[PDB]
Assembly symmetry: D2
Homo-oligomer: 463 residues x 4
């Protein structure tokens, strides 16, 4: 084989080497570490275990750090008891965090809650379970009219559609967790709750300050603010993670399908990676087979052009992880098998688009790419070649990062001294990789007499 890559959230059931080795067999490409939970020793051990498995097997995989991110939550209730709210009632949120709540008022974690919000704005609680309209704001209290019946619990998430939340890009725990990821040398950071271009910058500058200058930032679009500013968040980021379910809360349902499709197209055009996350196969936390509806949502996400699909909970705290990875990989293959190229001016555009067109008109099973930082490999994938992309590189972090891009097989190599040298070596390695055989045609894309970041040469060879 397939081409679409599988991100698996790793947790206790799958933290072992014995399991990771099996996960990789089943189709896993990337380990996600969800830092909403777990301490550094737990996560660090997961990293070392995967590294060990990679060493012993010679298989390659990437490591993605997903941040907890900033948040707004309600707080405690009397006796920890759920209270029932009636549509039409008055209801109040207070900035005073010491307040224990009940059916008339509750506390919130964000001191600026009473600040960012205006009368007429809508408040959503517990992923939209309950909705409210702000009617007045008095000092440190925010007064609302409830709009539907529902039970309010403790420590519940809060959403403010079409409102710019003035939290910082990074919670302090995020600042420490990112430092841990630089120390551990992760390959990607998934930054949660990205709302503006500014947020990406604050994070990239943070990573630059700890030797993570070469870590790719994947901006998690979780809400409407991020959707409104997508173009500039995309420009600043190395990739995008679309959190369909979390975005499902803030915008109209009828619009979610097309937001995912809009972001995919623009991410693909930018030669940047995109991940379909959340609400994938959640039935497989309890069940050993997915729903039809689930299998179709994944396949449609792949047909929309996703680089990678992601499992969370199905693989972290689920009962049937290896089955979920396997049915995922089987859906990936089944769906990839039938997709077509998009042979749609910068120089790189012209060359890579032509290189795919040439590969297809000659029935070449392989496009060999020489890349230092990865842009060349990602520039070919944009056109969805039938051919597999074999990306030669001297950079280990780049060999890792290309695991996440669609239909790319990375291979680390010592050096590439010339263009003719690249051709000699690329043919050699095409053969020993089993992806092509003597007599097959191959297209070989590279940059000649230019700095990294530019792809200007295409060459055709017979093995």
């Amino acid at each position: 084989m397939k081409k679409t890559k599988i991100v698996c959230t790793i947790g206790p059931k799958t933290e072992s080497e014995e399991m990771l080795a099996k996960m990789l067999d089943a189709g896993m490409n990337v380990m996600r570490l969800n830092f909403s939970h777990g301490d550094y020793a737990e996560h660090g051990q997961r990293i070392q275990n995967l590294r060990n498995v990679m060493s012993k097997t010679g298989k390659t995989a990437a490591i993605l750090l997903d941040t907890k991110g900033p948040e707004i939550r309600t707080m405690k209730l009397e006796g920890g008891n759920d209270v029932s709210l009636k549509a039409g009632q008055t209801f109040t949120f207070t900035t005073d965090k010491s307040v224990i709540g009940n059916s008339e008022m509750v506390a919130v974690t964000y001191e600026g809650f009473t600040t960012d919000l205006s009368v007429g704005n809508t408040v959503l609680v517990d992923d939209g379970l309950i909705g409210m309209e702000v009617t007045a704001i008095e000092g440190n209290k925010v007064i609302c009219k409830v709009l539907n019946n529902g039970d309010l619990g403790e420590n519940k998430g809060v959403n403010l559609p079409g409102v710019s939340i003035a939290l910082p890009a990074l919670a302090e725990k995020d600042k420490q967790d990112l430092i841990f990821g630089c120390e551990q040398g992760v390959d990607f950071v998934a930054a949660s709750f990205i709302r503006k271009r500014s947020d990406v910058i604050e994070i990239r500058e943070h990573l630059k300050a700890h030797g993570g200058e070469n870590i790719h930032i994947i901006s998690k679009i979780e809400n409407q603010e991020g959707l409104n500013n997508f173009d500039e968040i995309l420009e600043a980021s190395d990739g995008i993670m679309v959190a369909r379910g979390d975005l499902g809360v803030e915008i109209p349902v009828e619009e979610v399908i097309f937001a995912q499709k809009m972001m995919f197209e623009k991410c693909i055009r930018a030669r940047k990676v995109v991940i379909t996350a959340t609400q994938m196969l959640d039935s497989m936390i309890k069940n050993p087979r997915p729903t039809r509806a689930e299998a179709g949502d994944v396949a449609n996400a792949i047909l929309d052009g996703t680089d990678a699909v992601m499992l969370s909970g199905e693989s972290a705290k689920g009962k049937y992880p290896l089955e979920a990875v396997s049915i995922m990989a089987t859906i990936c293959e089944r769906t990839d098998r039938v997709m077509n190229s998009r042979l749609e001016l910068r120089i790189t555009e012209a060359v890579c688009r032509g290189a795919v067109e040439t590969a297809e008109k000659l029935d070449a099973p392989l496009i060999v790419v020489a890349t230092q930082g990865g842009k060349s490999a990602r520039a070919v994938r944009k056109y969805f070649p039938d051919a597999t992309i074999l990306a030669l590189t001297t950079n280990e972090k780049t060999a890792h990062q290309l695991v996440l891009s669609k239909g790319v097989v990375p291979q680390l190599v010592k050096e590439i001294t010339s263009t003719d040298d690249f051709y000699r070596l690329g043919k050699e390695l095409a053969l020993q990789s089993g992806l092509a055989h003597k007599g097959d045609v191959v297209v070989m894309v590279s940059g000649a007499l230019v700095p990294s970041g530019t792809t200007n040469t295409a060459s055709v060879h017979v093995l």
Copy 2:
């Protein structure tokens, strides 16, 4: 507005005229009568009520009769108590219907159960909850090895993948219910459990024998046998209903998305109507808002090119029917709004494809079609015109049936004596229909000097 048509199953909550009038407002086009439940008086009353509403409002709608169909079910257990089955255990089905069952054997309704089935075939129970493998067949007993744990209940459905079930096309209740539908003058029959071309024929011959010669048969593909024989079932039928969830049981999940897409394409090519049924918005039986996943499955079904989407239970026995119809209609509009034509030789093909291409190159908001039996209107819809189709006809049943086809506004008229006459009248009626305005261009498709069943003329006019 929208173009995709909504089929609503009608039941007690929505059986009233007061409700039907509101349903139609919300976007309902077709009433489905699911004859798995209800007696003739209940259904007949629903028909008369809709007829009354149609008369009073001047709105047009169609009536679809959905059959119970033949079936295989298990039967009774001791004390009516669910029993627990253990993977690996031996388990037996018996043809003797008098037998009360338990964790070792149970009865089945089909005398030919022990006949159609061979050793090695697989048996599925309760929509695949439990799976079994036949190990032996002794007279009127069929012995199996269970394959997974699960609780067996009373009166549960049974599936036999890749096995030709030799039930008749029609149960006796179906024979009577179809006679009732001829008497009531329904517009469509949805024939459940269609497996072969033969089955469609038996039903059409049945309907011809009771004055239903002009009723369109929609073949419900519910399983694998029907999928294998689809091409010939399509050829014999006037339309197709894809029951994604029921088909989800008999074939691999990874394949269901592409079976729906395969059937849609071939149904569209044939100028025959297709309905997306089952697992639409079932969360709205209990909840007043759908899931994101649900809204995306519908929209993807529409983008796959469905003529119509269908609600069952959401509208029949649901708590929030009018909300379901409304969010459905809003998804239909949102998704229809962004679809493109498919301007891809018979004569009709050449003319209608050209008539859409001409309509688009002149920005015509309306294609006026003259049709007796409907084939002309359905032949234009095949290309998914941006323009609305205004279908003039002298046949009441055809005015009704065109409600189900995508983007078609039918209008009954007294007569069409000539082609020039059709143009005069079509312009007149285009204006008074509010779908076009003075100065707009319109394309007018018809058959001149040919019998019904052929569309050979295209004409362009300014209002």
Copy 3:
């Protein structure tokens, strides 16, 4: 099958009925009357003879009147003796018509010669044999430096390349000849030396004032001014005649091929006919086989998309008229046989007439039957160069004749067309009787329904 139409200039060698009948058999479609020569009795006689033959044989043909046109010529020399002019010499033209010329000066027929012409303009004499450059203008004298050696004769033609010549649209002979064409009920007038839109209008008003409002004007492009004003001359005219040989004198040679190609495309786009005239097969005046170069020039003109090719002298005063028409028809068929349609690879007529041809080819229909009052529908189908032949039904006799000149059109006169369905039932019947299609063949039937003429809005497909 053939499709391209052949215009034949008729003269003494070929004016008899016995000959006209033979020309038509050989492929002649249109008779040209060259009014540079001959009097009304001769031409009227040619007209009557073709009319007689048409009635007797039942063949249909068109009649085009080509004007002599205005002119600038030199005049007499001493003793009528050719004089030898030496490159570099001074040489003078005079307006005074009484002046007899010599190796130093000669007179010219155009009093406005000293006005229209500026210092430095180029003057050509005897189809460019000799060229001169104006150095000064003194009253009725135009003074020049000769540019090449050559012998000047009596009464030689004059060209002023890239010069706005102020001759009238119509010579006084042209006015009385056009009146004659109204009397005779000709189908086309080829108007010489068209330079401005004003000229076309002057002619359109002339024909309207004498009952020729239904006569199609074909404007002859002969020089740079008309070439510069081509777009507006085309708009006012019903068609164009390209006088390639006369353009070879007035503009740079390297530009003539592309001037012809520019104009053909623009006439096709406008649904108006174009004629390839001059220097077709002139070698066939003396000889019974053309040169390679001649046949290739014609074939490329046909591939450039001309409606019709024209024979002059080859058919009028030549020794081998029937042979030229025959090889002309053979080049037409051979070349038409291999041309393809041009499906514009927006108004109603465009979308409809164009969609009708695409429909015809995707169904391999050999015939497109068109209902046309004034002819615009048939010519709008022709724009796309259909493989199918066009069968144009009409109740107008003048239009039935005029469509003879358009490429690939078979006109058929009919009593009436009362409704659209009626047209479909008359067209099927008549498609069969024309032998151009047979039972089982598909046909596309284009018409204007519930609209005035000038709009073609309906396409319909039928099986015979």
Copy 4:
């Protein structure tokens, strides 16, 4: 810049160095040596003079040897007096060379005249002036009925349309002339009267046996047999010369234009050069301006896609050689300026050389730099008619010369090309020094990497 190449036949009027230098300035690219006339000292002298001029001025040009070729001619008459032949009369040809002729019979030079020819075949004499039909064959006599009136002269050419003539591929004079071309190191041989693939091979073996294995054979198609066998003659040859005027005699006129077009397309497809020869601007032998018809014939030949146009007599023995070359170059530029690429709207070279031109145009690159040993890469880029000019680097001197004849190619001799990157760094440097592009311009650089010559597999884009 212009793009189309001009072949000039050099003769007495133009053989001096002072003239050759002037020809080249005016647009001459290739010198043709017509071995129908002149001896080795004259031609060798012309060769030396161009070589001298090339060295002194630094311009590059190619040298093409055109053979006299085999022939069939009539012979002498009584008193050397023209005789008048009457249509319908009996008339006889004899193989006996001692026979003096009269109005009843004449002798011919070809002993196999009575063999190759069958009863009913057509015989033409003096470029088709007179035609005859064979009625019987008796020993050394060939008996005919004359078909048209005409005067027969002495020593007149003979054509046998649609006849398999059994002359040898090479006359004995042609063999000694080809040996001369090996001695002189010419770049092309234009081999006359090519009819079969055997003839091309006979010639290829002849040149290989005298050290001319690297000389490109241009096969002259002059008759129906070679036309029928064109596909196989093309395969064996390096290029084609179309002798249109000689074909006008041997096949039907209506077919000549399409024979030329059929062959041009097939040569372009094969990456081999084609030359438009004969009847180009023959009027410029006597006159300093061509006719319209001539300039339009050339322009259509260029639009048909010819690599080169050829002047014969116009440049050799004419009165206005420099004027013909100049107007020829002006037609070439005017016409090339408006042609578009043909992007095949599968093997490696095709996909690569074609994708390279598409890449060049989508980036508006004015120059495609090609690395070529034997020339195939440059000609494979040329196949698609790029707007860009082709800058062909090579280490082979013969190939640098031969690419002069291909359309839109600037050859540049270079010391070495050691690697692909090296080529990119030599090509950028040299693109600038050629003035054909400037800093900031894009260039596409096509080459064969890690492969033998004959395969072009790499396309690379660079900024200067």
